[model samples]
Target: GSPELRQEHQQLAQEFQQLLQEIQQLGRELLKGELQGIKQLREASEKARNPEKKSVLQKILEDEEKHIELLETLQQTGQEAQQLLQELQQTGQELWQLGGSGGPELRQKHQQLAQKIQQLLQKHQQLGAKILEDEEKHIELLETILGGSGGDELRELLKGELQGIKQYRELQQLGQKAQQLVQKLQQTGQKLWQLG
Candidate 1:
């Protein structure tokens, strides 16, 4: 059982690394998607012939702007996480090689990393909060500009289907907290952006 424990631990660690990579990959994809959406908005603005439809396109464009901001924030956070994971992994490997020669230093670094990670999480919360707020404003403007079904459909839409003012406010609070955490990490720690 002890011998098997090592293998299981390694497997779980590898799985977590894979998940981190996947999130980073998804972040890039999301960023690309947002960029494409912005382009689409531009095209829609130029080609939409009908005034009403053009107006709709304008609203969509505004949403896309917010989306770009959200994606950028997410992408930045994802990249930071990926970088930290790699750094921690490398540092761990070095510590193992040293055979506890510099254990105290490694432990200190580990503690510092833990704090940095907490900060990053906070930043993400902040960003999410802002995103939720913008989304709610967009939804309200959408309703005012382009009417939709108002009865049961609205109820259904409100059931986690649409971003409302309240939802946006909640998300804003959460996102702001998360974003602040991340910003703190960036401010007070060794970062990987320069490595690239």
Candidate 2:
């Protein structure tokens, strides 16, 4: 049951499980929205008169901009992950459609399929790792912003999502898609995670 895939044959299964890990993570990226409850804070910045207040909001908006950019890239990279998985699925299905006991061509095509999987697997991993590093930085900044000047503070302002107010409607649509994607992804990784 454990994925101690040491042999060559075992290796493919392990790699596939790892790919499933990435697939599930696509939902992880999609499901969780970053830095909630900043909408009111951003609006406060729009109407505030305090110099210190403006400075803090400036930092928040600047940092918030970077967060939005990071999310955009994560969305794009997640798209690539899905594409790779779909292509691999089709390739794998073709291999199965082949006669299981046919000529040496079965192994030949399978070896080719395995190599394709490896290529997609490597690309997806690098993308996932890179975005993960960015998320670490993003979360750190948000923590610092929220942690500062906490006592008698901006409780009212803490609710805003920040960044382009014009884009809020568009982002609502975005979140809906992410919710659906996450719902689907949550279903995919259970088998693989349990195996590993």
Candidate 3:
């Protein structure tokens, strides 16, 4: 009973770590860098009553355009990880079905499956660490832009822009899919040992 409980606890720990990794990745990608720049430009334009800052705003747009592409790549990577997790879960189920009749070959297969899952988990950890770094940078950049006077006012403007935005919608969809995948994996893991 104690061993089973411990194993369950360990699995729960892994599941929580995996979910946190996915959530961090989503937070980094959901940030709308372009809109923040645009908001700043609008503020400057209104205050100056001139188009002098227009070029600066255009440069900001071009520079942060890469963020959009990077965000897309992050989403794609996350999707791949999600699919891999799902596959591993199915393999685990199949292995369980093999039971003692599986013998040496089954044990080998199980070990191999465990190895693959470990590798995938490592990838998720690395992705999460990188995302944490990116998020730090994102926060610092935003702070500089928002640190000046009217920062709160501009934050309100940014909030307005994010409302019903396309990227936010995409993030919502991805988040839901992520939740489902994580839960499925948890169910499979729990079922694996509960049979005893």
- For all predicted structures, in order, the TM-scores are 0.55, 0.43, 0.45
Off by over 4 Å in 2: 1-38, 99-153, 156-196
TM-score of 1: 0.55
lDDT of 3 by residue, 7-106 (tens): 6644753564476466556556455544464456456436543243344334434444555555566556556655655555565456556644544664
Query: Candidates sorted by lDDT, descending order?
Result: 1, 3, 2
Residue 13, candidate 3: alpha-carbon lDDT: 39
lDDT (10s digit) by residue, model 1, range 24-72: 5645554565565467456746776757757865875777687777768
Q: Which ten residues in a row have the lowest lDDT in candidate 3?
A: 48-57
User: Which residue segments of model 3 deviate by more than 4 Å?
Assistant: 1-63, 100-196
Q: Per-residue alpha-carbon lDDT of model 2 for 86-149, expressed as tens digits?
A: 5545644554355245566644554454445445445544544554454445334445545557
